[PDB]
Structure 1
Amino acid sequence: GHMVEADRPGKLFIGGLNTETNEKALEAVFGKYGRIVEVLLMKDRETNKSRGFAFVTFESPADAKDAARDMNGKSLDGKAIKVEQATKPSFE
């Protein structure tokens, strides 16, 4: 057909995290802004500790954007966490 609907910034980018977290707990971090259907934790290789960064996705891009408009630059369990938009509006 015609299609000009190809934008969906449903991805976010998290930093500053704990070492002893899991994806089920990230549901409690961000799901309240607009529901999650995909979480990606990422870990070390030394001794399986979590690293101080992870990835969370949302069902909708309007639910993704909002999860970075309140929760950015706060504490979480006494660590200092971050959220950013890991995109740009256009790139060519």
Structure 2
Amino acid sequence: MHHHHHHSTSVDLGTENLYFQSNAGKMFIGGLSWQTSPDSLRDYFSKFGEIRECMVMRDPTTKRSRGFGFVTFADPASVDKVLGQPHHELDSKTIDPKVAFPRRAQPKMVTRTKK
């Protein structure tokens, strides 16, 4: 009665869009350096706790970094340890490592006073 559709022309990978359970637990590392690599971040942060995965935003056009990334800690205790420690130095400069924040809903009424 019902038929399933399949795609034949696929260029991008399909291993991320299936998982929806694991989302929270990541840390957004800001102000990284030009030398800081996802491996460097994993190597540096692995020193505070255990990391599951690391990611640094780069451009395939220039291969240059934007100065921000994330780190996925495999321990809830490491997030606690990092949360208490606000100061983080990398390449002799202070960067902005913080835990992800959720989105909020919208209230009622916008325009109350009409002319």
Do these two structures clear the TM 0.5 threshold for a shared fold by scoring above it? yes
How many Å separate the matches in 2 of 1:9 and 1:38?
A: 13
Corresponding residue for 2:100? 86
Structure 2 unmatched ranges of 5 or more: 1-20, 106-115
**Separation in 2 of the partners of 1:63 and 1:13?**
14
Helix, strand or coil at the partner of 2:45: helix
Contact 1:43/1:49, CA 8 A, preserved across alignment: yes
Give the structure with the higher percent strand. 2
Higher relative contact order (CA 8 A, sep 6+): 1
Taking only aligned residues, the RMSD between alpha carbons, in angstroms, comes to 2.6
How many pairs are equivalent? 84
**Contact 1:40–1:55 (Cα < 8 Å) also in 2:** yes
Partner SS state of residue 25, structure 2:
coil
Report if aligned partners of 2:52, 2:74 keep a CA contact under 8 Å in 1: yes
Q: Which secondary structure state, in structure 1, belongs to the residue aligned with residue 51 of structure 2?
A: coil
Gaps of 5+ in 1: 1-5
Q: Which residue is 2:108 aligned to?
A: none
Question: Residue 33 of structure 1 aligns with which residue?
Answer: 48
Deviations 1:8-61 (A, max 9, x none): 842111101112321221123211222111111111355111111100011122
Range 79-88 or range 30-39, more displaced: 79-88
Match for residue 18 of structure 1? 33
TM-score by length of 1: 0.70
Cα distance in structure 1, aligned partners of 2:104 and 2:48: 28
Q: State the TM-score, normalizing by the size of structure 2.
A: 0.59
State which structure, 1 or 2, has the greater radius of gyration over its C-alpha atoms.
2
- Of all paired residues, the percent bearing the same amino acid is 38
